[PDB]
Amino acid sequence: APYNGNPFEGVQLWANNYYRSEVHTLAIPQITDPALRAAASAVAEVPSFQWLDRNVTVDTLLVQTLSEIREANQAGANPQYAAQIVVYDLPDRDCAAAASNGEWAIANNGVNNYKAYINRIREILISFSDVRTILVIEPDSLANMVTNMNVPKCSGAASTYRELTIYALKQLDLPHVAMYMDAGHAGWLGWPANIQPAAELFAKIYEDAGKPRAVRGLATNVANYNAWSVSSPPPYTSPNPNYDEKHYIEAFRPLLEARGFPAQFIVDQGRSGKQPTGQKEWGHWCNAIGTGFGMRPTANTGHQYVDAFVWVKPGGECNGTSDTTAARYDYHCGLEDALKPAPEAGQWFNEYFIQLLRNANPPF
Ligand SMILES: CO[C@H]1O[C@H](CO)[C@@H](S[C@@H]2O[C@H](CO)[C@@H](S[C@@H]3O[C@H](CO)[C@@H](S[C@@H]4O[C@H](CO)[C@@H](S[C@@H]5O[C@H](CO)[C@@H](O)[C@H](O)[C@H]5O)[C@H](O)[C@H]4O)[C@H](O)[C@H]3O)[C@H](O)[C@H]2O)[C@H](O)[C@H]1O
Ligand SMILES: *[C@@H]1O[C@H](CO)[C@@H](O)[C@H](O)[C@H]1NC(C)=O
Ligand SMILES: [Mg+2]
Structure with a gap:
């Protein structure tokens, strides 16, 4: 069915069974304290995004979730x-x-693989046209074209990221869908030197995709820990004047709008409840200590430019291993402010889940 306006208005948000099963089968059995068990059970009911971060999730998780919501x-x-x-x-x-x-690699049929993945997602979403579906498109993608074109892999991928983003925006432009493109966070694209180039890029993509109706705007703070709005800049944000997501969005929207893209935003708060965090530096993204579950998902943001506060990255799912010998080890996950020992990316990290519960704000 079609919708008008903010896709978060007039619906509930489904809390999926993948995350609920992680909490009930993996987390709770490891927790003996009655109050923490109860808190854990409650967070399993908070509706966070489900990630299609591997192709195998399309004909499994996506189908299952949409079937269960129907x-x-x-x-x-x-x-x-x-x-x-x-x-x-x-x-x-x-x-x-x-x-x-x-x-997938561009060198190993990656473009074709990705187009087929989008095409299959489109088929499934059409099948489930009765289930209003809100998408975040490709974290950690086009933000790299703003600041990281010195990296050979990024410069070599840029045309592909752009073309395939436009492909997704057009193929998933369905009346029951809303899309938000990833736009980094205040401490990446919100720095003053980056924010106008970012606006130019995202507004151009929007234009070049034909301004599809389903595109509502942009998602920020995905998988990061930033505040929505705090009185004092956290120490690791200095000297960025855009030290929280409200500052970033209020500076970014007018630039985007003058360029043709009056973007509405969704802001991840799933690991933002404790401010400041235990990050020693803003760019320390992996399994950061001193973080908590944050404000619950809602359409009732109170802010004109924000369609919803959301939980995009689900807290408790690991960001990367701390085993320095592992094939896909990322040194960010070995830093002093990264909780250890941490399992492979995507695996349940129960100690981290407990940290997020202890620091939750609002508490569980
Ligand atoms: C005055 O301003 C000037 O001086 C300033 C001081 O030097 C700098 S500040 C400087 O800005 C730069 C950017 O311009 C950043 S670097 C920046 O950091 C980002 C994170 O904060 C990352 S995005 C990050 O990338 C991760 C991979 O590296 C992924 S991990 C990925 O996650 C998913 C989801 O969880 C998971 O499934 C995957 O398995 C994982 O692989 C993460 O999701 C992303 O958030 C960005 O790439 C990097 O460029 C510096 O920190 C900052 O100090 C001013 O720039 C300058 O104007
Ligand atoms: C991706 O999954 C689909 C099924 O959803 C499958 O048909 C396809 O072969 C997979 N892609 C690759 C490149 O293996
Ligand atoms: Mg509910």
Whole structure:
């Protein structure tokens, strides 16, 4: 069915069974304290995004989630549940990363692989047109074209990232869908030297895709820990005047809008509840200590430019291993402010889950 305006308005957000199963089968059995078990059970009911970060998730997780939401809605959910899904499988993924977990390479048929992945997602979304579906498109992709074109892999991937982003925007432009392109965070694209080039890039992509109706705007702070709005700049933000996501968005939107793209935003807060964090530097993204579950997902943001506060990266799922010998080890995950020992990226990291519960704000 079609919708008008903010896709988060007028629906509930489904809390998926993948994350609920992680909490109930992996986390809770390891927790003996009654109050922490109860808190854990409660966080399993908070609706976070489900990531299609490997191709195998399309005909498994995506289908299962949409099928379960259809079932709940046909069984009388009021208001209807909507799905929250991340598209995250560009070839030569994470071009500036020390190590990437992306499965596809441009050199090994990656373009064709990705187009087929988008095409299959389109077929599934059409099948489930009755389930309003909100997408984040490709974390850690086009933000690299703003600041990392000195990296050979990024310069070599740039035309592919652009073309395949436009392909996704057009192929997934369906009446029951909303899309938000990743736009980094205040401490990446919100620095004053980066913010106008970022606006130019995203507004051009928007133009070149034909300004598809389904595109609502941009997602920020995905998998990061930034505040929405705090009174004091955290120490690791200095000297950026855009030290939180509100500052970033309020500076970024007018630039985007003058360039043709009046973007609305969604802001990850899933690991933002404690401010400042235990990061020693802003760019320390991996398994950062001193973080908490943050404000619960809602359409009732109170801010004109923000369609929703969301939980994009699901807290407790590891960002990367701390085993320095592992094939895809990323040194960020070995830093002093990264919790250890940490398992492979995407595996449950129970100590980290417990940290997030202890520091939750609002508490569970
Ligand atoms: C005055 O301003 C001038 O001086 C300033 C001081 O030097 C600098 S500040 C400087 O800015 C630069 C950017 O211009 C950054 S570097 C920047 O850091 C980003 C993170 O904060 C990363 S994005 C990060 O990338 C990760 C891979 O490296 C991925 S991990 C990926 O995650 C997914 C999701 O969880 C997972 O499934 C995958 O398995 C994982 O691989 C992560 O998600 C991303 O968030 C960016 O790439 C990097 O360029 C410096 O920190 C900062 O100090 C001013 O720039 C200058 O104007
Ligand atoms: C991706 O998964 C689909 C099924 O959803 C499969 O048909 C396809 O072969 C997979 N892609 C690659 C490159 O293996
Ligand atoms: Mg609920």
